[PDB]
Design brief:
- It is classed as transcription/inhibitor.
- Keywords: activator, transcription-inhibitor complex.
- The assembly is monomeric.
- Among the domains are: 2-192, Glutathione S-transferase Yfyf (Class Pi), Chain A, domain 2 (Up-down Bundle), CATH 1.20.1050.20; 193-345, Immunoglobulin-like (Sandwich), CATH 2.60.40.
- The protein is built from 15 helices and 17 strands.
- The protein has helices spanning 2-52, 57-124, 136-165, 171-193, 239-247, 332-345, 361-376, 384-395, 412-416, 427-441, 443-447, 457-464, 505-510, 513-519, 532-535; strands spanning 195-199, 204-206, 210-217, 231-238, 259-260, 263-265, 267-269, 274-284, 296-306, 313-319, 323-326, 358-360, 409-411, 471-476, 484-489, 497-499, 525-526.
- Helix 2 (57-124) runs parallel beside helix 4.
- The longest helix is centred in the first third of the chain and has 68 residues, at 57-124.
- Bound molecules: ligand MQX.
């Protein structure tokens, strides 16, 4: 891939230049060590002058002049090697600065781009979007970042220890403080950012229901963390409690309810190299709520762990995607609309649960189509024609051209607060009502094309006129939520086009949609041409004999 293999180039380049500094560090370590032994030779030259100063000037003539020559040269060498030791120290800090600034570039790419892309993909998958996929790619990149930063951290620890053993003043001290300032800044960011929720908890959480979540740390294996697997504490929080948590204005263990099994320990898995806490049996015990259906909450996962050193401790916190809490499950219907809006229209880097008031119509379309396909479980989504029908209903306009609605904004109030033109419901109620009846028992029929649905009473009439005396279509009724009305043709005294009473799921519980179509004589050709028993053959109930009626084997009528 494009910037996928570009990452690997600037990753390998980091490992190469980090090895060059490793070579220069072991080299300087030797240069210094020799210099220390040579300095003791300079000290030992003087003590030699004392034992030399005993005998006659017959021996002292040669001894004192040779010892002077050896002391001058060694003293000039020690003085030049002393500058060399300092110059080399600087060149190592310059190199360490260079590989760290380059490491920051690669860090930001992994964390602020590829990670955010994964998290956005995850966000939209809540609304039915495409799956975000495995973290494998980002774990490998995070491990590299963790490894390279750790290597550079221990290198500058060793570089520092040499300086304390042999101090040389100047720029070195300040440049070393700067590399350390950067080194901690990089690890802190790397640590906090890779404590992520792999499998988010249910966004429409029903009280007293077993739910699950999975919080992975991407730098578990490649750092001194899996050795002591840390305890992770799940905690339900409010939208205000989250805005405070992020601005650092929290007050102790502030929260909004109890969670059974809200504590779990991370597990290290060899081969996968993954450190992950799978909260398999969580459950909501109670809630706080100072609309109920428009109330955002979040599962706050926290943990504390050390990274090798006893001093090096980090406190990690990650927030779940906003969840709406329900108790009776009856209001799942409206909860879904708030979650839908949030998952679709959340702005990157927003303050906790900041969604826009209005959005342009085709933005909302994208979302409705996304969720629609996902719910009815079919590849047949909302066509440009169906999109016009919903634009007509929502905006209360007459136009049949989709491009007309392009600049129009749907507010949250227009979507699921104020009711439609002359109805006892909102657009989301009508739309979700339709997905619900389809999903509940019409998934095959929708997929098979047998339910045109998104056509108005007029649209249906200006279609079945030019059709034989039994042609009919299936339509979504505007008056009865989740209702499917039949539009058919049959020439009689006054009327020749007819709209039968809409069927609600109640009616479908008694007799099937297919059992009801086959039950009616007049209905004989499904629109446009297709015969009735051709489209609904499959779904016809083969009346099976009862046991009470005395049948030893399964029989049909
Ligand atoms: C074996 N079998 C299944 C039967 O018994 C079949 C017999 N049947 C009928 O013919 C019933 C009996 C009463 C009148 N009737 C009708 O069919 C009449 N139709 C209506 O009364 C209405 C049509 C619409 C359409 C909309 C709408 F288009 F969707 P909108 O866009 O405004 O929402 C809304 C309200 C209404 S009221 C008639 C066709 C005009 C004669 C009938 C019985 C119990 C039913 O329960 C559900 C459907 C249904 C069907």
């Amino acid at each position: 891939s494009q910037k996928h293999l570009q990452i690997n180039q600037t990753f390998e380049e980091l490992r190469l230049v980090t090895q060059d500094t490793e070579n220069e560090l072991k080299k300087l370590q030797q240069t210094q060590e020799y210099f220390i032994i040579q300095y003791q030779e300079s000290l030992r030259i003087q003590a030699q002058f004392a034992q030399l100063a005993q005998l006659s000037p017959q021996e002292r003539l040669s001894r004192e002049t040779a010892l002077q020559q050896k002391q001058v040269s060694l003293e000039a060498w020690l003085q030049r090697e002393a500058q060399t030791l300092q110059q080399y120290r600087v060149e190592l800090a310059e190199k360490h600065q260079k590989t760290l600034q380059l490491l920051r570039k690669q860090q930001t790419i992994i964390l602020d781009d590829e990670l955010i892309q994964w998290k956005r993909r995850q966000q939209l998958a809540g609304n039915g979007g495409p799956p975000e996929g495995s973290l494998d790619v980002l774990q490998s990149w995070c491990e590299k970042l963790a490894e390279i930063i750790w290597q550079n951290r221990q290198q500058i620890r060793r570089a520092e220890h040499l300086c304390q053993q042999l101090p040389i003043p100047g720029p070195v001290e300040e440049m070393l403080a700067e590399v350390n300032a950067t080194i901690t800044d990089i690890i802190s960011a790397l640590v906090t950012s890779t404590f992520i929720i792999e499998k988010q908890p249910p966004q429409v959480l029903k009280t007293q229901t077993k739910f699950a979540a999975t919080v992975r740390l991407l730098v578990g294996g490649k750092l001194n963390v899996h050795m002591n697997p840390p305890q992770v504490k799940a905690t339900i929080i409010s939208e205000q409690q989250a805005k405070s948590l992020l601005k650092n204005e929290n007050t102790r263990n502030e929260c909004s309810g109890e969670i059974l099994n809200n504590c779990c320990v991370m597990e290290y898995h060899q081969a996968t190299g993954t450190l992950s806490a799978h909260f398999r049996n969580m459950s909501l015990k109670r809630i706080k709520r100072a609309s109920v259906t428009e109330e955002k909450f979040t599962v706050l996962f926290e943990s504390q762990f050390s990274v090798g050193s006893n001093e090096l401790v980090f406190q990690v916190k990650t927030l779940s995607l906003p969840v709406v809490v329900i108790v009776h499950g009856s209001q799942d219907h409206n909860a879904t609309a708030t979650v839908l809006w949030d998952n679709a229209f959340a702005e990157p880097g927003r303050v906790p649960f900041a969604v826009p008031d209005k959005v342009l119509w085709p933005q909302l379309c994208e979302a409705l189509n996304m969720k629609f396909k996902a719910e009815v479980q079919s590849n047949r989504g909302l066509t440009k024609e169906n999109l016009v029908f919903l634009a007509q209903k929502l905006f209360n306009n007459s136009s049949s051209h989709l491009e007309d609605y392009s600049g129009l904004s749907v507010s949250w109030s227009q979507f699921n607060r104020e009711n439609l033109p002359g109805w006892n419901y909102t657009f989301w109620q009508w739309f979700d009502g339709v997905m619900e009846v389809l999903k509940k028992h019409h998934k095959p029929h929708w997929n098979d094309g047998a339910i045109l649905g998104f056509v108005n009473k007029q649209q249906a009439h200006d279609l079945l006129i030019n059709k034989p005396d039994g042609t009919f279509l299936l339509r979504f009724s505007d008056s009865e939520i989740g209702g499917i009305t039949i539009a058919w043709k049959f020439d009689s005294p006054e009327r020749n086009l007819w709209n039968l009473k809409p069927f609600t799921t109640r009616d479908f519980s008694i007799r099937s949609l297919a059992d009801r179509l086959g039950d009616l004589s007049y209905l004989i050709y499904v629109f446009p041409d297709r015969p009735k028993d051709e489209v609904f053959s499959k779904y016809y109930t083969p009346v099976l004999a009862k046991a009470v009626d005395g049948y030893v084997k399964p029989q049909i009528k």
